[PDB]
Amino acid sequence: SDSAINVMKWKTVSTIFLVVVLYLIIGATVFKALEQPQEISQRTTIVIQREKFLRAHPCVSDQELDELIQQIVAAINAGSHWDLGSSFFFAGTVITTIGFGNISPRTEGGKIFCIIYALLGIPLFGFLLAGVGDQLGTIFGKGIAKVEDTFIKWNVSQTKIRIISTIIFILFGCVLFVALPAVIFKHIEGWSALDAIYFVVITLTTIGFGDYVAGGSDIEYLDFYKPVVWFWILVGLAYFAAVLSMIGDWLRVIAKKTKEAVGEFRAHAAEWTANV
Amino acid sequence: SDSAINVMKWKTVSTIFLVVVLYLIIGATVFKALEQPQEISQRTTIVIQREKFLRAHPCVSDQELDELIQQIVAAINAGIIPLGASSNQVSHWDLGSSFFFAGTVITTIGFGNISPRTEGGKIFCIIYALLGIPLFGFLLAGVGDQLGTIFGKGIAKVEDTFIKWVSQTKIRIISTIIFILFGCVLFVALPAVIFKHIEGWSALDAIYFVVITLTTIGFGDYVAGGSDIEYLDFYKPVVWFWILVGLAYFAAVLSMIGDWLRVIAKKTKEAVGEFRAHAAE
Numbered sequence: 001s002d003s004a005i006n007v008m009k010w011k012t013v014s015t016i017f018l019v020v021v022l023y024l025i026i027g028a029t030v031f032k033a034l035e036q037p038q039e040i041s042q043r044t045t046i047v048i049q050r051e052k053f054l055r056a057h058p059c060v061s062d063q064e065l066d067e068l069i070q071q072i073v074a075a076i077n078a079g080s081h082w083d084l085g086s087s088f089f090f091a092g093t094v095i096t097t098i099g100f101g102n103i104s105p106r107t108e109g110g111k112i113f114c115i116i117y118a119l120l121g122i123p124l125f126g127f128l129l130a131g132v133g134d135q136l137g138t139i140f141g142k143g144i145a146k147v148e149d150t151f152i153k154w155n156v157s158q159t160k161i162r163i164i165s166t167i168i169f170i171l172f173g174c175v176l177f178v179a180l181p182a183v184i185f186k187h188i189e190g191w192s193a194l195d196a197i198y199f200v201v202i203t204l205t206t207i208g209f210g211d212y213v214a215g216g217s218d219i220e221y222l223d224f225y226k227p228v229v230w231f232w233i234l235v236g237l238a239y240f241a242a243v244l245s246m247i248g249d250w251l252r253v254i255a256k257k258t259k260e261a262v263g264e265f266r267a268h269a270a271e272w273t274a275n276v
Numbered sequence: 277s278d279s280a281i282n283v284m285k286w287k288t289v290s291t292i293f294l295v296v297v298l299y300l301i302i303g304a305t306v307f308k309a310l311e312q313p314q315e316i317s318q319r320t321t322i323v324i325q326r327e328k329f330l331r332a333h334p335c336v337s338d339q340e341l342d343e344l345i346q347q348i349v350a351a352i353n354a355g356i357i358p359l360g361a362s363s364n365q366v367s368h369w370d371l372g373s374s375f376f377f378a379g380t381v382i383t384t385i386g387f388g389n390i391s392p393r394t395e396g397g398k399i400f401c402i403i404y405a406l407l408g409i410p411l412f413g414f415l416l417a418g419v420g421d422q423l424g425t426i427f428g429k430g431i432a433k434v435e436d437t438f439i440k441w442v443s444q445t446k447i448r449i450i451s452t453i454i455f456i457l458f459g460c461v462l463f464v465a466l467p468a469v470i471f472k473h474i475e476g477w478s479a480l481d482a483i484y485f486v487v488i489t490l491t492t493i494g495f496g497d498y499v500a501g502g503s504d505i506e507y508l509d510f511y512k513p514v515v516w517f518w519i520l521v522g523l524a525y526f527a528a529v530l531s532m533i534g535d536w537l538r539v540i541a542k543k544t545k546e547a548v549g550e551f552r553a554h555a556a557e
């Protein structure tokens with residue numbers, strides 16, 4: 001039966017689907033809980049500042065403010081943004097798919113080029129990213145040969161030390177790829193420590209909201225900085241790929257276990273009930 | 277020779293690196309050529325419009341205008357419509373919008389129109405993304421397999437009816453053509469048509485929207501379901517479904533293009549090698 005495996009397949013898809021739907025619903029209610037408040041407080045104090053500027057500058061007629069805001073809002077759909085260095089940064093947001101959005105094409109032909117550039121660029125960057133991941137793979141692999149030698153000539157031995165190696169990968173990786181660059185970002189951009197870590201995670205997972213962008217204010221920057229950020233992008237993307245990938249394996253495991261716990265729970269509940 | 281393959285490896289990485297640098301430079305100069313002009317023309321006519329209300333209201337402190345615009349622009353990120361003729365509004369963080377938000381996180385499309393402002397919305401977003409992205413990847417994998425089989429069935433029937441006086445490797449060419457063509461109709465063209473009519477976007481803006489969304493670049497300059505229009509609410513559901521299946525399809529296509537570049541790379545390596553060896557007799 002070719003249909004029988006395909007039924008077992010669709011069974012699995014359907015259950016992961018519903019778990020994802022469930023993940024979205026829980027997420028939606030937690031986000032709403034956290035943000036609908038601030039949205040209300042930001043809306044009332046925008047309405048305050050509106051009236052407080054009609055009166056504290058009486059020269060402005062109420063009708064011309066509405067025209068001023070239209071001109072501002074219209075020009076937000078535009079804003080130099082497109083110098084060589086910025087347009088290079090733009091190209092990086094395309095091929096990495098971080099896609100921050102602070103800058104994006106407005107011209108019919110900038111958009112047509114972006115389509116072509118992305119379709120060829122994303123796969124090309126993927127090869128680089130793969131190569132870079134392999135390099136980091138070996139460098140870390142050397143380092144865990146040396147720490148599965150020195151810590152396997154004394155204390156508690158095989159299979160529990162798999163757990164220790166992965167902890168060192170997360171801890172050293174978070175220092176090198178999250179913490180250290182967050183420290184720099186805090187000092188150089190003037191972001192809070194939380195905003196910087198948020199920035200790191202939103203950028204390296206490639207979510208890339210664009211609410212924060214390193215090198216993105218009109219600050220003066222030492223031009224070692226952007227280069228170093230580029231390098232961090234290259235290596236941070238590989239590291240987050242690996243980590244995201246690890247978490248996937250953890251969910252695969254935890255899924256096996258929850259299936260067995262439900263099965264235990266059934267087997268025992270049953271021969272409790274049969275015994276009656 | 278564990279070091280020998282690793283040396284050959286680093287050699288290849290270094291060359292792809294430089295090709296990528298080169299790809300970025302060419303890209304940068306083409307984008308600049310295409311955008312820097314309009315940006316200059318838009319900046320001079322913004323400075324024009326500035327003067328017509330800078331000096332037609334001199335009693336406004338005018339350094340304080342710059343502070344007013346900062347407050348407006350800052351509050352556009354939240355998404356205020358600070359008008360008296362439209363002072364009553366919908367919320368950006370109602371359940372359906374905050375559900376959409378969660379989708380932009382786990383897919384990593386991350387459009388950015390909406391994004392947490394609270395210290396704790398940000399802390400949740402970090403946790404939510406680290407667990408969510410891997411979870412969605414399993415779904416996306418499963419969905420890809422489904423489409424895999426459904427198309428595989430369809431090419432059993434079209435590699436049967438095309439059994440005329442045909443080989444094992446040349447019919448791979450026909451299958452891939454039908455995959456691009458049918459896929460572009462179902463996952464790019466058709467939804468662009470709908471998007472054009474429902475959102476009022478140009479046909480180009482819609483296709484741009486499709487490609488920027490399904491590659492997961494997700495600039496956020498365009499977002500289906502993003503205006504305060506009307507919307508039938510068959511619509512967003514259908515868009516959700518298109519996201520799910522469009523992401524799987526673009527994954528596959530992006531993956532194919534990668535193979536084509538792997539091919540063309542073998543060939544250019546041999547052409548350069550020929551060109552070297554012969555060197556005009």
Ligand SMILES: CCCCC/C=C/C/C=C\C/C=C/C/C=C/CCCC(=O)O[C@@H](COC(=O)CCCCCCCCCCCCCCCCC)COP(=O)(O)O[C@@H]1[C@H](O)[C@H](O)[C@H](OP(=O)(O)O)[C@@H](OP(=O)(O)O)[C@H]1O
Pocket residue numbers: 008009011012015016019022023026251252254255256258259262404407
């Ligand atoms: C640490 C910070 C604290 C935060 C809280 C932290 C909370 C914990 C962290 C994250 C949330 C949890 C995420 C992981 C999901 C856990 C739920 C259960 C695992 C799962 O997901 O559903 C599984 C098992 O469900 C069940 O029995 C029913 C139970 C479902 C509900 C259980 C509880 C989950 C709901 C509550 C928690 C999650 C909600 C979200 C939490 C929100 C936090 C923000 C089914 O699907 P299945 O794919 O496993 O099916 C097999 C298998 O998989 C095989 O191996 C083959 O293949 P394959 O899948 O390996 O490829 C397949 O195919 P075949 O053999 O049929 O051909 C097939 O046999």
Ligand SMILES: CCCCC/C=C/C/C=C\C/C=C/C/C=C/CCCC(=O)O[C@@H](COC(=O)CCCCCCCCCCCCCCCCC)COP(=O)(O)O[C@@H]1[C@H](O)[C@H](O)[C@H](OP(=O)(O)O)[C@@H](OP(=O)(O)O)[C@H]1O
Pocket residue numbers: 116117120123124127128287288291292295298299302303537538539540541542544545548
């Ligand atoms: C309609 C629109 C069309 C517009 C026209 C646009 C037309 C062009 C279209 C798109 C962009 C360019 C396509 C042409 C190919 C470019 C890549 C150059 C080939 C290359 O790489 O060097 C080759 C051999 O070259 C040389 O001797 C040096 C010559 C390099 C410079 C030659 C021209 C390329 C750069 C300039 C022209 C293109 C620039 C981009 C133009 C922008 C257009 C928007 C050896 O390969 P290798 O040692 O580097 O390593 C391989 C390889 O890298 C493989 O392909 C995997 O990666 P990958 O590079 O393909 O991504 C790895 O896989 P693995 O074995 O590691 O697992 C590994 O096998």
Ligand SMILES: CS(=O)(=O)Nc1ccc(C(=O)NCc2ccc(Cl)cc2Cl)cc1
Pocket residue numbers: 080081082085086089092093096098102103213214215216217226229230233
């Ligand atoms: C918005 S802007 O008009 O001010 N222009 C710029 C913004 C950022 C940068 C820059 O290079 N940032 C480092 C960087 C590099 C590559 C990638 Cl993918 C991401 C990042 Cl964060 C340059 C110009």
Ligand SMILES: CS(=O)(=O)Nc1ccc(C(=O)NCc2ccc(Cl)cc2Cl)cc1
Pocket residue numbers: 367368372373376379380383385389390499500501502503512515516519
């Ligand atoms: C303008 S708004 O920010 O105020 N609110 C909303 C904006 C958009 C949507 C929506 O459902 N779009 C379909 C959709 C679904 C999931 C994903 Cl991942 C991407 C997309 Cl395009 C809903 C609310």
Ligand SMILES: CCCCCCCO[C@@H]1O[C@H](CO)[C@@H](O)[C@H](O)[C@H]1O
Pocket residue numbers: 006007010422426
């Ligand atoms: C609105 C009702 C439409 C019902 C469509 C049929 C639903 O069944 C499922 O359709 C999948 C897609 O082809 C199959 O692959 C699954 O094996 C099958 O269980």
Ligand SMILES: CCCCCCCO[C@@H]1O[C@H](CO)[C@@H](O)[C@H](O)[C@H]1O
Pocket residue numbers: 183184187188220221222
């Ligand atoms: C590891 C932390 C590294 C942070 C280095 C911080 C140095 O601050 C520098 O202060 C200068 C004022 O004298 C500014 O003009 C420079 O733009 C700025 O870079």
Ligand SMILES: CCCCCCCO[C@@H]1O[C@H](CO)[C@@H](O)[C@H](O)[C@H]1O
Pocket residue numbers: 287288291545
């Ligand atoms: C004169 C020496 C050749 C210089 C040509 C410039 C390009 O770099 C070389 O391209 C090769 C592909 O053929 C790589 O895979 C090599 O490792 C690398 O050295």
Ligand SMILES: CCCCCCCO[C@@H]1O[C@H](CO)[C@@H](O)[C@H](O)[C@H]1O
Pocket residue numbers: 543544547548
């Ligand atoms: C199927 C072949 C695809 C195109 C590859 C042609 C290779 O020839 C030339 O190689 C040079 C490198 O030394 C480049 O400088 C030229 O730009 C390039 O045209």
Ligand SMILES: CCCCCCCCCCCCCCCC
Pocket residue numbers: 108109112113306
């Ligand atoms: C409607 C306006 C269309 C503008 C066309 C934009 C296409 C520009 C493509 C530039 C091609 C780069 C050639 C380099 C290939 C080696």
Ligand SMILES: CCCCCCCCCCCCCCCC
Pocket residue numbers: 176177180181184228229232
């Ligand atoms: C020498 C072996 C490879 C070294 C790997 C990089 C280590 C440095 C950590 C990353 C430093 C950049 C962080 C600051 C980015 C703004």
Ligand SMILES: CCCCCCCCCCCCCCCC
Pocket residue numbers: 112115116119120479480483
């Ligand atoms: C009505 C507007 C016409 C523009 C629509 C886009 C057509 C060109 C898209 C690019 C197709 C070539 C893809 C190249 C694959 C590497």
Ligand SMILES: CCCCCCCCCCC(=O)O
Pocket residue numbers: 085086088089226227228230231
């Ligand atoms: C890995 C070392 C950095 C490679 C990228 C160099 C480009 C720097 C351009 C900085 C800028 O955006 O002006």
Ligand SMILES: CCCCCCCCCCC(=O)O
Pocket residue numbers: 021371372373509512513516517520
């Ligand atoms: C991944 C599948 C989730 C689709 C659930 C349908 C919800 C659509 C929301 C419609 C609305 O917010 O008005």
Ligand SMILES: CCCCCCCCCCCC
Pocket residue numbers: 193194197399402403406
């Ligand atoms: C100033 C400290 C910021 C706190 C950042 C914590 C991020 C969440 C930790 C849990 C990771 C899954």
Ligand SMILES: CCCCCCCCCCCC
Pocket residue numbers: 462463466467470471514515517518521
């Ligand atoms: C054959 C079943 C449906 C095929 C895919 C439909 C997705 C396109 C809908 C686009 C909505 C904007």
Ligand SMILES: CCCCCCCCCCC
Pocket residue numbers: 460464465483
């Ligand atoms: C007039 C519309 C023509 C549609 C072309 C769509 C091309 C999609 C390219 C994705 C591989």
